[PDB]
Design a protein around this ligand. Structure first.
Ligand SMILES: N#Cc1cccc(-c2nc(-c3cccnc3)no2)c1
Ligand SMILES: *[C@@H]1O[C@H](CO)[C@@H](O)[C@H](O)[C@H]1NC(C)=O
Lengths: 198, 195, 198, 200, 198
């Protein structure tokens, strides 16, 4: 097997529309935001403009191959893969993807998709000039899949030294809520960005 | 039947261009706006910038399958489905869809499409600082189908605590307008004010 | 015949690239602008931002069908139809189409396409505060077809109550223009928008 | 032959990726800008916002047909034609095409493509309020083809210019440059368009 | 062989999704930025708006042909070629490509892709009024390929005389970075732009 063969098969056989549920268990999706820049902040309107790398990760065994005398990994266009329908609940602009839309696929079916995204959010900007800082919370989950089809889970350093802002702390936490309407839990990852102006 | 089969069949058979009229009766489409944010308001120009979840609902039985030992629901790209040509009559910008363009399809043919949309409207903004508040009305209906092909019908809580504004009341009511055929719309009245 | 069959045939046998000239006569295209909103006006730069419904209407016999026990009309994506290459000569932005790109087709081949468009124009804005008002002229014609392939012809009420402006008068008249580069003539419809600030 | 047949054949065969070199001669491409509007000008940043009709003409005999009892011309979507990869060297925004993307094709293979474009440029804006006016130069050439594959050539100045612009045109001149660099042994042609304009 | 044949074969065969690794050696990609304009600068937010020609060079032996009595080169749409997934690490806007998306392909398989790009970056703008000038660093590397799949390597004159700024110096150097999350090196080219206001 060479790269050409692996990518040929992936393209011919993968079903982007089909969630790779294994066994009627949820697909375990891991999400982790690496903040790169805070670009525009408005304490009056409570709106932030952020650049982050959305480290996403999951498994699709229909992509697997025997890497015996073969590449262990390939880069694959995401249009040829199933991808989690993740959305930020408090986003107020379309996610503007800044990077090549490729995912990294390992021979066992592990997939890493880490786009660089610029997006605006509605969050708490109060205290951004305070030393103690503002804390902006961003919630990311599947837009249409519930906890038994997709589970989301969590997993400062790549942040721009030239930003007008700096990061005090970032915490990532998972919410699971059960409602009266529905028998299923809804999962999201809440990312708390503690930042202030320099 | 597994998900792969269901999505394979939906894709191979579904005619997105073809309104799922059952019987020469209208397709019953339900619309309900869940406001999430009021972002920019202008009392001079009478223009608002709004973020809402457009809960849209209908039946397309050509999508149905026997869910005996099968999933009861799947997520389907809307490009593979027929979708109501709904438009906001008083919108003044393109609807900017913020979410994955998927719809949720139940084995009986029930379809739920609930995109998150950011859009600008021309409406009455007067009184927004008044604590009686402004009342902005948004009308949504089919752009090309009349009441016998498509009927629209109606059906605060998910609104952002961090908005500069707050919601006093939201009412949804249905109009039918004849200019030889009736065109229905849903009128959504958004009563809001600045904090 | 049901809707599915009609749309199937239209899709399989329409020729979006082919002007439905019948007979070596021009295709009679009717244009009529229904103004909905005047959004941004600048008397210094002489630029207006307008929202209108472009009631475009014309015939194409090759779409026709026998509506005996069949629907008399269907909604058809414009990508599956021939559409007049109409342009606004004094437009200074791309036409931003706000509505579903569908046209209404009658069984005799009559086609109605009425998109809602937001567009900026270069026109006379002088007198917009005067109560006599400004008069902005917009010219619409085929971009590449001359008067023997396409003829354009003409045909306040839907205008927004909440606009900063109001409409005094709208008149639509037809010109037949020859330019210097070219031997042939290009018809246009001139739309005069008399409006003022409230 | 009717329009349907001509457009059918053009589409089934025209090869948009393939420069219609005849004979190992360059394709003769004519360029001519007809200014329609000057929209925003900034003498500090030296940037202009311009609307122009880019009159573009060339031959492609693989499009030709015998117009005996047939239409002499047809309108053809440019996606079905080869089109010169012209770029403005000093452009600082994407060309925003305002018009239907059709070209006019004559039965002998002559092609006329004349889009209306709004674009921003980096040029000399100094003197725009002076009555002598500013002179903004715009250079247009093939982005990847050299002078032996593509040759560019020039063809009333205010004639289609907007009477409602804040600006007016004193003069427009079009001249042709040919440039050979030290990297590559090959000449690259451009058309330099000088726009002499001032505020009213 | 004529151009039509060469382009026909290139399009029928070449695989844009498949990195032209030859031997299990990295594809040697050369990057070199030719700055054309510095358009908008903000010493407060540390953000610059730049126009540059990204001279990108590499070899794809899959594209080769025998140029005996044939053209030595052709222009090919990049949608029909494999292209390095290069990204600017400190970019804060999408790359806006200003030129026709073609690459130049030589009969030996050498490929030159040199788009003109407008992009916004987060970099050090301090000292831009100082005569010593500011020094903005831009890092470009493969987004998903490591040093054994893709190596990047380096290689003022085309800069606009009408810019509000001028260039003191441009230096290009190569970094190789190995993280604690993956056993593998990721190369980038660091471009240092020394510029000041006139
Ligand atoms: N038959 C038909 C047909 C075809 C295309 C477009 C339209 C059209 N309907 C409306 C409209 C406005 C307000 C309320 N309801 C409908 N505006 O345009 C109608
Ligand atoms: C290339 O083609 C020809 C004949 O078609 C022959 O002259 C030449 O030696 C060939 N060379 C290659 C490297 O095969």
């Amino acid at each position: 097997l060479d790269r050409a063969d692996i990518l040929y098969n992936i393209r011919q056989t993968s079903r982007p529309d089909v969630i790779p549920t294994q066994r009627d268990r949820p697909v375990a999706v891991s999400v982790s935001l690496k903040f790169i820049n805070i670009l525009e902040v408005n304490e009056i309107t409570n709106e932030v403009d952020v650049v982050f790398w959305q480290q996403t990760t999951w498994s699709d065994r229909t992509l697997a191959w025997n890497s015996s005398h073969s590449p262990d990994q390939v880069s694959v266009p995401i249009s040829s893969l199933w991808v989690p329908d993740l959305a930020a609940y408090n986003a107020i602009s379309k996610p503007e993807v800044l990077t090549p839309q490729l995912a990294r696929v390992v021979s066992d079916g592990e997939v890493l998709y880490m786009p660089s995204i610029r997006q605006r959010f509605s969050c708490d900007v109060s205290g951004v000039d305070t030393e103690s800082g503002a804390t902006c919370r961003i919630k990311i989950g599947s837009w249409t899949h519930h906890s038994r089809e997709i589970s989301v889970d969590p997993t400062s350093e790549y942040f721009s030294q030239y930003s007008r802002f700096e990061i005090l702390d970032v915490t990532q936490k998972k919410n699971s809520v059960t409602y009266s309407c529905c028998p299923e839990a809804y999962e999201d990852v809440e990312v708390s960005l503690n930042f202030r102006k320099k």
